[PDB]
Amino acid sequence: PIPVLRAVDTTSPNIVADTSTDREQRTFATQGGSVKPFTITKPSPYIPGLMLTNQEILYQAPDGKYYDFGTYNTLIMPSSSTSARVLPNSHPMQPLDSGGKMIACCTNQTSTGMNALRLKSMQFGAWMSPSKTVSLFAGGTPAPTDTLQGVDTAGRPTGKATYEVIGLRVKNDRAVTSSYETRGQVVTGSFLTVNFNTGKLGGTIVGNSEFGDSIEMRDVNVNGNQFSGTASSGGHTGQVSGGLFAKEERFYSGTLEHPSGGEIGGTVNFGSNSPLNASFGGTRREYNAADTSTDTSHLVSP
């Protein structure tokens, strides 16, 4: 049986909120809740008297309670038994001390492959209240605007980038996910492309019998590291709100290796307490700051 997750007591002197600018987080949530940084001190399991201090992120639910990301409040991992990797489309959520439930991306495990899940600078998921209302979220370290793609060669963002993503909804006490199967060959997957020349985002989060109807981006504008606009699913219009995540990557000398915005996430909101509401997150599969396209067609290098 899945264990009940207890809240973290952040009033402990060993758990200290991190107010540094470097660790500031941003969350998109449908009905409250956010990811928040802490410095946490814990006794060593191995060395007497030794205290171990590390940076952590906790999820603060809409009720104010804090939860860690751990082993039982994540998506089911795909099987490792063949080359094939299939993400199951339905997942149990972990019950909470409050009577709510929680789930977040299974970021942590190796040889899953499945690049959308390999998030390093964000998380996405959902919290359910004891009353069965849900707040879906995507939050993380925002992509600094000064190191977005193209800024180093033009002074502003330019070109295009394509992201490999997963969508999450909550249906009937379970988390349900968009179709994803890999074998960088992808049998089924969901892709979003940002055109920084035109400031547009396009793409489709692919549905199935569990997730429900696909979510098609319709008119989404991109301003700096944030975006917003409309999407459709089954005839219903939802409001898209999201952003680009992850700092830039540098070579040892300080030279830019990859721009900021290597991850992406957000929410799609079809109405207060709508079961269609979604969060999503994923990773940058490809980018080209020099692309002069004016459309949101995907980049498709092998």
Numbering used by the authors: 15 to 197, 204 to 322
Sentences copied from the publication:
The Neisseriaceae family of Gram-negative bacteria express a bipartite receptor, HpuAB, to efficiently use haem extracted from Hb:Hp complexes as an iron source. HpuA is expressed outside the cell, anchored to the outer membrane by its acylated amino terminus. Although a direct interaction between HpuA on meningococci and Hb was not detected using flow cytometry, the lipoprotein is required for the high-affinity interaction between HpuB and Hb, for meningococcal survival on Hb as a sole iron source and for efficient dissociation of Hb2023.
We solved the KdHpuA structure by single wavelength anomalous dispersion (SAD) following soaking crystals in cobalt ions. The structure reveals a single domain composed of a small compact C-terminal β-barrel (residues 157–322) and a more open N-terminal β-sandwich (residues 1–156). Prominent features of the structure include two long extensions from the core of the protein, one formed from two longer strands of the N-terminal β-sandwich (β3 and β4) (loop-1) and the second from a loop at one end of the C-terminal β-barrel, between strands β20 and β23 (loop-5). Both loops present hydrophobic side chains at their distal end including those of Tyr-60, Phe-271 and Tyr-272. Two shorter loops on the same side of the protein comprise residues 92–100 (loop-2) and 122–127 (loop-3). The B-factors of Gln-123 to Thr-126 of KdHpuA in the unliganded structure are higher than for any other amino acid; further suggesting this is a flexible part of the molecule. Strikingly, although the Cys–Cys motif of TbpB C-lobe has always been observed to form a disulphide bond, in our HpuA structures this motif is in reduced form despite a lack of reducing agent in the protein storage or crystallization buffers.
